[PDB]
Short mmCIF file of C-alpha atoms and ligand atoms in Angstrom, two decimals:
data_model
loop_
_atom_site.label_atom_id
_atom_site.label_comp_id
_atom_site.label_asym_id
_atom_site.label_seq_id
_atom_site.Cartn_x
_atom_site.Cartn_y
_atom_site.Cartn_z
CA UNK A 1 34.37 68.45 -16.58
CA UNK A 2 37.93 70.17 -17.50
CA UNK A 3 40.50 67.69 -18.69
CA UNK A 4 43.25 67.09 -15.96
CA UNK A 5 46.85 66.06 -15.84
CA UNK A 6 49.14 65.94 -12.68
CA UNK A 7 50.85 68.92 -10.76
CA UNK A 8 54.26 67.08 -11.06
CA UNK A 9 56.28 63.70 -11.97
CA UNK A 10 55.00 60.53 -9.79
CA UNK A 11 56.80 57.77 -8.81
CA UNK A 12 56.05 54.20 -7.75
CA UNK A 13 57.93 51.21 -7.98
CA UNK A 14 57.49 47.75 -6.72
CA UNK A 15 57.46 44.07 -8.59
CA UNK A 16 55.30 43.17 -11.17
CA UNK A 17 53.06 40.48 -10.04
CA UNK A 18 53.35 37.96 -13.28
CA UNK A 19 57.02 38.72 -14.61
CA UNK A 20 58.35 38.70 -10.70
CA UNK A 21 60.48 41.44 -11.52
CA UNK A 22 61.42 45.20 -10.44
CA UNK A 23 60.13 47.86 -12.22
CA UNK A 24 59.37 51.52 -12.03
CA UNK A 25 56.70 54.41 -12.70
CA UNK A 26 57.78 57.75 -13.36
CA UNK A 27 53.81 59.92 -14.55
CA UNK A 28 54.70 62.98 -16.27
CA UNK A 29 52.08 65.36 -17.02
CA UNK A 30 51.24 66.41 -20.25
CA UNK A 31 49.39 69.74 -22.08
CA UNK A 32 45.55 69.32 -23.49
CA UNK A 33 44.37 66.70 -25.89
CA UNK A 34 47.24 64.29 -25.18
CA UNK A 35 45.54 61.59 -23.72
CA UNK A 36 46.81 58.67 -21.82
CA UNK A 37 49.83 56.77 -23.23
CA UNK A 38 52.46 54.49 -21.89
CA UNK A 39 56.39 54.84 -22.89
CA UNK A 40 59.09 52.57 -22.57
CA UNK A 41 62.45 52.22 -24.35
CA UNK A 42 61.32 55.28 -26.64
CA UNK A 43 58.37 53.98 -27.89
CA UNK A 44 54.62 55.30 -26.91
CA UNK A 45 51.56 53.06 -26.31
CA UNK A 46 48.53 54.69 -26.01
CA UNK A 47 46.68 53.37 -23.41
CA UNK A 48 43.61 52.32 -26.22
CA UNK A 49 42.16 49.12 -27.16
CA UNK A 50 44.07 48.82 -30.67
CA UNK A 51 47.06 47.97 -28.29
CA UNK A 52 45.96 45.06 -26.37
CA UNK A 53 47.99 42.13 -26.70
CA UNK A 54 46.91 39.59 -24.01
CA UNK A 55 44.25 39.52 -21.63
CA UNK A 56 44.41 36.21 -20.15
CA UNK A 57 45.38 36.83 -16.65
CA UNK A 58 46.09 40.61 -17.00
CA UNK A 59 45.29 43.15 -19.83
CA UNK A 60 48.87 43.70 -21.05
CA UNK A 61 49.41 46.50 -24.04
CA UNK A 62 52.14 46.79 -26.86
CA UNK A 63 53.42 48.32 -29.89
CA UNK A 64 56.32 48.46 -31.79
CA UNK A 65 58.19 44.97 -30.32
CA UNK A 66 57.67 46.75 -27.07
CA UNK A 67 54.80 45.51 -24.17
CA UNK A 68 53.78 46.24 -20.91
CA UNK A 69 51.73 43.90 -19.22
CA UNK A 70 49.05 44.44 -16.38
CA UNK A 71 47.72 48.10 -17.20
CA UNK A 72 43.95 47.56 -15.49
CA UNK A 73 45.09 48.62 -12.27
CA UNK A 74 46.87 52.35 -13.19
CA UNK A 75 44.41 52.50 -15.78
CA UNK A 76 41.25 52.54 -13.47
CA UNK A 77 42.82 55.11 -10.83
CA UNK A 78 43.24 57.08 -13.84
CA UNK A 79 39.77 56.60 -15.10
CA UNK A 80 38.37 57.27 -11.45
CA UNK A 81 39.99 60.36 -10.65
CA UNK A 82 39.63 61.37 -14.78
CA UNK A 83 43.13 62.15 -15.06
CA UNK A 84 43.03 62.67 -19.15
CA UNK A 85 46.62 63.66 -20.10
CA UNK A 86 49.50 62.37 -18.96
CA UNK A 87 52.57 59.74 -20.08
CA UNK A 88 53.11 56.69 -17.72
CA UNK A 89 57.21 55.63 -18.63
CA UNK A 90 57.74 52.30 -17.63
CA UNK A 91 61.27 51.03 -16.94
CA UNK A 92 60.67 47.60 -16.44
CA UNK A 93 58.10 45.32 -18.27
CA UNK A 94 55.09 45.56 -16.18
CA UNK A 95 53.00 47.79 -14.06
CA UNK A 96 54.13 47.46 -10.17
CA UNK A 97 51.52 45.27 -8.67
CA UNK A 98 52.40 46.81 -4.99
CA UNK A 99 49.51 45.70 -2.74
CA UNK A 100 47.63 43.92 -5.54
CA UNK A 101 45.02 47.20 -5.21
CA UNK A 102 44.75 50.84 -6.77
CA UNK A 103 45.02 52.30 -2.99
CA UNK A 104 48.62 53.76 -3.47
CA UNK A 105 48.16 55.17 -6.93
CA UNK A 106 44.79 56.79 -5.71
CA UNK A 107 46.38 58.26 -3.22
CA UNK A 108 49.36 59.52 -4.53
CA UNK A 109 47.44 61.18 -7.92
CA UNK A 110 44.28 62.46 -6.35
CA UNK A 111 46.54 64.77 -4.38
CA UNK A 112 48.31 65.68 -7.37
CA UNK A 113 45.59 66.69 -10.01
CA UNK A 114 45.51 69.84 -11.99
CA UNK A 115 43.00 70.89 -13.88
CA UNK A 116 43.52 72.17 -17.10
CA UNK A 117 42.10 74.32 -20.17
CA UNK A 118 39.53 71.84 -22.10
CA UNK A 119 36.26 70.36 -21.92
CA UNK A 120 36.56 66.54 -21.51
CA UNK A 121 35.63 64.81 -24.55
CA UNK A 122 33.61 61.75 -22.64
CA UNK A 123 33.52 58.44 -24.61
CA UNK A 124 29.26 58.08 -24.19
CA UNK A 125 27.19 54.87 -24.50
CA UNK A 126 24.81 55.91 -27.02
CA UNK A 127 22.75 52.48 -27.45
CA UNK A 128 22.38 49.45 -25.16
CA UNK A 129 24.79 46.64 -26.10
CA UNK A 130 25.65 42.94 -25.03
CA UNK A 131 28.67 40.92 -25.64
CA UNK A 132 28.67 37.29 -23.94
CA UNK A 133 31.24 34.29 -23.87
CA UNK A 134 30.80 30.84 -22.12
CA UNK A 135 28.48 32.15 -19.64
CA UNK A 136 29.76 35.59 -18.70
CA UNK A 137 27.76 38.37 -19.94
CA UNK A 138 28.71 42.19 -19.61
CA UNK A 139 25.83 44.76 -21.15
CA UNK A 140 26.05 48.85 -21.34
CA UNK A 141 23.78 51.11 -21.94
CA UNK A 142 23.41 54.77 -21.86
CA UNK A 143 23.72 56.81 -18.97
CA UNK A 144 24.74 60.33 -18.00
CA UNK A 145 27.49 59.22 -15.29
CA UNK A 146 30.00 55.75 -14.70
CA UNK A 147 27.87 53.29 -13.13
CA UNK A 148 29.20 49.74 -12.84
CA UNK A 149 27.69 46.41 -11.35
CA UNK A 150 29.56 43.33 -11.13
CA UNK A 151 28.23 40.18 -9.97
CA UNK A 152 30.08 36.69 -9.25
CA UNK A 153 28.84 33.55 -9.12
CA UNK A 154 31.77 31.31 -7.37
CA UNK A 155 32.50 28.07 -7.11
CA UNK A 156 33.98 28.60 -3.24
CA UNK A 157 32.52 29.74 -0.52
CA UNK A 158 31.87 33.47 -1.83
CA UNK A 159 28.81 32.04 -3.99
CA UNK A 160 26.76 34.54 -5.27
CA UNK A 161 27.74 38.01 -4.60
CA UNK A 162 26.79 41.57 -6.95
CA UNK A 163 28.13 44.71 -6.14
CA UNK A 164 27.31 48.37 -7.90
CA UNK A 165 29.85 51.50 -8.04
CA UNK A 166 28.24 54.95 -8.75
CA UNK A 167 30.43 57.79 -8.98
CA UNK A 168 31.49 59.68 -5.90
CA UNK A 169 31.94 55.98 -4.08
CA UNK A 170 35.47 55.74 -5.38
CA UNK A 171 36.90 54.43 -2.65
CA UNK A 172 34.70 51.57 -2.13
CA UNK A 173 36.66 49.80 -4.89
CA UNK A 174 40.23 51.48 -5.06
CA UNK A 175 41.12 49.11 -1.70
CA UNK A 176 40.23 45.84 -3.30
CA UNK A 177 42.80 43.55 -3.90
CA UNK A 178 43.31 41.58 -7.30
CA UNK A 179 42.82 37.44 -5.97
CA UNK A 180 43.41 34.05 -7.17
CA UNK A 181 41.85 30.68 -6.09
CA UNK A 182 44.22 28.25 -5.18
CA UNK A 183 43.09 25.46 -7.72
CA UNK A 184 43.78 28.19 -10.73
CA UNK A 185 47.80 28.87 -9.57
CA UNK A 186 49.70 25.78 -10.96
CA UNK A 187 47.93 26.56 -14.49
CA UNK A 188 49.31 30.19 -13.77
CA UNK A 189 52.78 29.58 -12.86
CA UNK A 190 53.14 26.38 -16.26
CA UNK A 191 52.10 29.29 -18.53
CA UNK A 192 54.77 31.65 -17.50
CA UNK A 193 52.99 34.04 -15.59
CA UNK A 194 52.69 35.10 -11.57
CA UNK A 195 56.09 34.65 -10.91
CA UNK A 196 55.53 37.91 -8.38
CA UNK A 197 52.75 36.75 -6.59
CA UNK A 198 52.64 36.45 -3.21
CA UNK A 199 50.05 36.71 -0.44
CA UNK A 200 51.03 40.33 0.04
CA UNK A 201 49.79 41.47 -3.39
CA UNK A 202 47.20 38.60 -3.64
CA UNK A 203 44.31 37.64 -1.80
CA UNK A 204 44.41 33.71 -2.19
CA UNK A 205 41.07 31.57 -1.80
CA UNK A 206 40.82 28.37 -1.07
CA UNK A 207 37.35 26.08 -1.37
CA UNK A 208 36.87 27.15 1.83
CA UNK A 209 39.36 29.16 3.12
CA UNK A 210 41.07 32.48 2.79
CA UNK A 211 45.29 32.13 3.10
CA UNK A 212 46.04 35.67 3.41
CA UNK A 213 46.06 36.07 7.62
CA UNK A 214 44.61 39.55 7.74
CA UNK A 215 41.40 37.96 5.60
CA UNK A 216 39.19 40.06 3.37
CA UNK A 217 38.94 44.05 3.40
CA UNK A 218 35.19 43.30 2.75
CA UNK A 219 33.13 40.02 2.51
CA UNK A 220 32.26 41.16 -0.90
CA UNK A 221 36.20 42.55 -2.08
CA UNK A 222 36.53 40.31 -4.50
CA UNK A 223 33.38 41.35 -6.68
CA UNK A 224 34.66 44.89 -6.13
CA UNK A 225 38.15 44.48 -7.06
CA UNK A 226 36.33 43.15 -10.80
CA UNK A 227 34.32 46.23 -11.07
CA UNK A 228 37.25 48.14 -10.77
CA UNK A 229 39.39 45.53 -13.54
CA UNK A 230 36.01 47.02 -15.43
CA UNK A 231 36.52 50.35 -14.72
CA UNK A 232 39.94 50.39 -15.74
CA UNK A 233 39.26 48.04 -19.17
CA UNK A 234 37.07 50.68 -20.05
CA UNK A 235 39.56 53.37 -20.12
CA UNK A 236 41.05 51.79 -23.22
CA UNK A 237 37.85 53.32 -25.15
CA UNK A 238 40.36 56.92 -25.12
CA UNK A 239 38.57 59.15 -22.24
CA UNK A 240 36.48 59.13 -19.52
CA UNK A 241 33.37 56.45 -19.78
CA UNK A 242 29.66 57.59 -19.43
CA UNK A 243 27.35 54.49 -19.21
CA UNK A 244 25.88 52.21 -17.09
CA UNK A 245 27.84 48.45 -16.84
CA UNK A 246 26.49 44.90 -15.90
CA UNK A 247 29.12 42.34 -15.73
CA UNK A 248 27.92 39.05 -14.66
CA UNK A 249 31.13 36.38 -14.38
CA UNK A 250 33.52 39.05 -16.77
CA UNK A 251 37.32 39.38 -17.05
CA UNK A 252 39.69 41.53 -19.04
CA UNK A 253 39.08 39.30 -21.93
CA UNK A 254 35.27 39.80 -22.09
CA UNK A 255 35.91 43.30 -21.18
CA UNK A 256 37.98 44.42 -23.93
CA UNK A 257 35.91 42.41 -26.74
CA UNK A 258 32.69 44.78 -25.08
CA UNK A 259 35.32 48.00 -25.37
CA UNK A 260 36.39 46.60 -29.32
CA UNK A 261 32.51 46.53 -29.96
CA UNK A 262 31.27 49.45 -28.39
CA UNK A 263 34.26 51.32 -30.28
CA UNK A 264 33.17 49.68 -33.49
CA UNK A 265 29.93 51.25 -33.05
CA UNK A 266 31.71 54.39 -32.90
CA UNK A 267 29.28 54.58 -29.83
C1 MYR B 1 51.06 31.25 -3.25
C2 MYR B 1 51.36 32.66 -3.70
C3 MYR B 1 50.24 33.22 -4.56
C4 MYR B 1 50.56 33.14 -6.03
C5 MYR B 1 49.75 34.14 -6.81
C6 MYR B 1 49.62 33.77 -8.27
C7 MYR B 1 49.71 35.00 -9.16
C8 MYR B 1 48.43 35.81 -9.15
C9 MYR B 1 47.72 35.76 -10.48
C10 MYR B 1 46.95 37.03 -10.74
C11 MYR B 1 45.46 36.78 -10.76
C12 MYR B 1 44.71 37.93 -11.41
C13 MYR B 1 44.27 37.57 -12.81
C14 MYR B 1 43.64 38.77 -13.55
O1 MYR B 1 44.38 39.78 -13.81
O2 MYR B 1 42.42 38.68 -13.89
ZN1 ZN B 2 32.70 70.34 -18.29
ZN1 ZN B 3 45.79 30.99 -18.91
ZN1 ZN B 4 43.77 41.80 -13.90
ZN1 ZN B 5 42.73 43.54 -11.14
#
């Protein structure tokens, strides 16, 4: 596939789910080889792995004494719709959560793409691999296109639940919503963090219940909102992913340490 960027600047805008404050997208495109980079207050941070700084409850990037924190969202429309060159500015310090999904940036950029002069340089999974941690267990191996299965095993009503994304189903997974069980929020809100939360950009569980009054998009959204934290992790590897994914109970912090290894590998 030939490398793409966008026809023209993009703007979104909204508060950022953990810092509760306003801030602001503006993607500009950018010419062949570029890649995808952040920049705010003059500084660039390529959207690669080297940059992490916290994954905890959001895979937040920096360099330079400046950060931007939740990046999994953008990053996985981006990845999806393999937009390869373009600069996200952020004026604000952290990705607009808007409906807690990737629907509006989806949207908005798929409508927008241009292709452009050069072959894709695809990041391919050349051997299988497994990375583990308390439990959760993500493995890759080779394959020739993105395929990505999650499953959850939850300690609420959802139970067990597994769902796969194979290209072309995009849009199975750009409409879930990032959620939160209500016995994990007072942890959240003593470290700092979801000060912008609210049930409009989160889906809330309960042991038993489901807050939000217009309930789940699908009985399964919350396993498919994870593959596509996945999807988006991945994108730190520097371009487009080719290999097949099993997550089983993974977050941005298992994700990245699989991204750190299979880079390592210079898979
Ligand atoms: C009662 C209003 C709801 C408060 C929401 C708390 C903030 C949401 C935390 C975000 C959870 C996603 C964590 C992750 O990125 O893996
Ligand atoms: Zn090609
Ligand atoms: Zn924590
Ligand atoms: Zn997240
Ligand atoms: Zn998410």
């Amino acid at each position: 596939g030939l490398e793409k960027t966008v026809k023209e600047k993009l703007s979104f805008e909204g508060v950022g789910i953990h810092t509760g404050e306003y801030s602001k997208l503006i993607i500009h495109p950018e010419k062949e080889g570029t890649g995808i980079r952040f920049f705010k207050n003059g500084v660039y941070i390529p959207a690669r792995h080297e940059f992490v700084v916290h994954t905890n409850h959001s895979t937040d990037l920096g360099f330079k004494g400046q950060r931007i924190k939740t990046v999994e969202h953008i990053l996985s429309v981006l990845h999806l719709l393999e937009i390869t060159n373009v600069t996200i500015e952020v004026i604000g310090n952290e990705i607009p959560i808007l409906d807690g999904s990737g629907w509006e940036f989806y949207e908005a950029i798929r409508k927008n793409i241009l292709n452009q002069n050069r072959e894709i340089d695809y990041f391919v999974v050349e051997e299988p691999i497994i990375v583990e941690d308390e439990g959760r267990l993500i493995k890759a191996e080779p394959s020739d296109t993105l395929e990505v299965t999650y499953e959850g095993e939850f300690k609420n009503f959802l139970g067990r639940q597994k769902f796969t994304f194979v290209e072309g189903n995009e849009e199975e997974i750009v409409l879930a919503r990032t959620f939160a069980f209500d016995w994990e929020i007072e942890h959240i809100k003593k470290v700092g963090l979801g000060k912008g939360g609210s049930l409009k950009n989160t889906l809330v569980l309960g042991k038993d219940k489901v807050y939000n009054p217009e309930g789940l998009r699908y009985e399964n959204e919350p396993v498919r909102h994870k593959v596509f934290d996945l999807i988006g992790d991945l994108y730190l590897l520097g371009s487009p992913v080719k290999g097949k994914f099993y997550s089983f109970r993974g977050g941005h912090s298992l994700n990245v340490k699989l991204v750190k290894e299979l880079a390592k590998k210079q898979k």
